[PDB]
Design a protein around this ligand. Structure first.
Ligand SMILES: [Ca+2]
Ligand SMILES: [Ca+2]
Ligand code: NA
Ligand code: NA
Ligand code: NA
Lengths: 103, 104, 103, 104
C-alpha cells in the first residue's frame, strides 16, 4: 500500500527532523557518554570484557536487566544504583522533550 | 456496575477507534517486523528454538528482561543492544502519538 | 516542615480523587483481573504455588522481570508474551489517562 | 559545539530549577523513604547484606530487575509485589508532574 509507505516516510522525516534539535542532540550525547562511562567502569571494576561491559550498561541503563550478571564488588553495586537513576533522568528528559514537541 | 460496563465499552471502542490511525498501524507493523527479525536472528545466531527466540525477543524489546538466557555470542550481544534501542524508539513513537492525540 | 505536609496531603487528595474517576476504576479492575488470570494460569500450566504465580505475574506485567523463573511449557511462553502486551496496553491506558487529566 | 554547551547549560538549569518544585521535592523524599524501607525490609526479612538490600530495592523499584536474587520468603514476595506498585505510583506521579509543567 502506497498510503502505507507515505505514512512511514512522513514519520521517518519527523524523526530525523528531531535528530537536528539541539536539546535532543544533547540528551543523545549524554546517553552515549553515559554508555561509554559504564562500559569503562564495568570493564575496570567488575572486570568484564569491554563488549560485556557495554552490554550490561545497556540492559541496565534501559531497565531491561541482565539475567546472569550482577555487580560483584561494593563499588559496582553503588555505581550501578547511581547509573540506573541517571538513566531514569535521561528518559524523563526525552519524555519531557516529547511533551514539548506537541505545541 | 452499569457505569463500569458503559465506560469499559466506551474505552474498548477508543482502543479500536485508535487502531484505525495510519500512524499507529505503521508502528504496529514495525513492531511485528521487529519481533520477527528478532525471532529469526536469535533462532539462527544463538541457535534458540523459534518460540524461545520470539520469547526472548519479546521480553527483551519490552524491557521486561529474560531471567535465564543472555546472548552467548558477541554477535548476539551487539544485535541485542541495537534491538533494545529500536524498542525504545518504538515506545517513544507510540507515546508521542498519544501526546498528539491528546493535545489535539 | 508544615509546607511539606500540606503539599503531601494535597497530592494524596489529587490521588484519591482519581480513584473515583470511572475510567481509572475500569483500568484498575482490568489489571486486577489480569493479575488474577495470570495467577491462575501460571499456577495451573506452569504449576507454581499460587503465591509464586501471582509474584511472577506481577514482575512480568510490570516489566520488572523475574531473575530465576522462566516459562517452561510452550503454552506458558505464548501466554506470557500476550500477557506482557496486555500489560503494555494497560500502562498506555493509564499514561493516556494522565495526558487527559491535564486539561 | 558552543551551542552544545549553551543548550546543555540551559537544560542543566531546568533540571535544577525544577528541583525547586515542592511537589517534586515530596516525590523525591517519598522515593528515598521507599528506598530506605526496602533496604531495611530486605536486610531484615530476606537477611540480605544492607548494600544488597538497597541494590535489590533499587533495581526492583525501577523495573530494571535483579538477575540472581528473588525473595525467598512468602513475606518478601508479598512486600515486593507491593513495593513494585508503589514504584509505579511514584513514576506516574513524576510523569503527571511533567505533563502539568509542560501544558502550563
Ligand atoms: Ca526488567
Ligand atoms: Ca538468573
Ligand atoms: Na531479569
Ligand atoms: Na522495565
Ligand atoms: Na519501563
Amino acid at each position: 500500500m502506497l498510503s502505507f509507505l507515505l505514512t512511514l516516510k512522513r514519520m521517518l522525516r519527523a524523526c530525523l527532523r528531531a535528530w537536528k534539535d539541539k536539546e535532543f542532540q544533547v540528551l543523545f550525547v549524554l546517553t552515549i557518554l553515559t554508555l561509554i562511562s559504564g562500559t569503562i567502569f564495568y570493564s575496570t571494576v567488575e572486570g568484564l570484557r569491554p563488549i560485556d561491559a557495554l552490554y550490561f550498561s545497556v540492559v541496565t541503563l534501559t531497565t531491561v536487566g541482565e539475567g546472569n550478571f550482577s555487580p560483584q564488588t561494593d563499588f559496582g553495586k553503588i555505581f550501578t544504583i547511581l547509573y540506573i537513576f541517571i538513566g531514569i533522568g535521561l528518559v524523563f528528559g526525552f519524555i519531557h522533550k516529547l511533551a514539548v514537541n506537541v505545541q
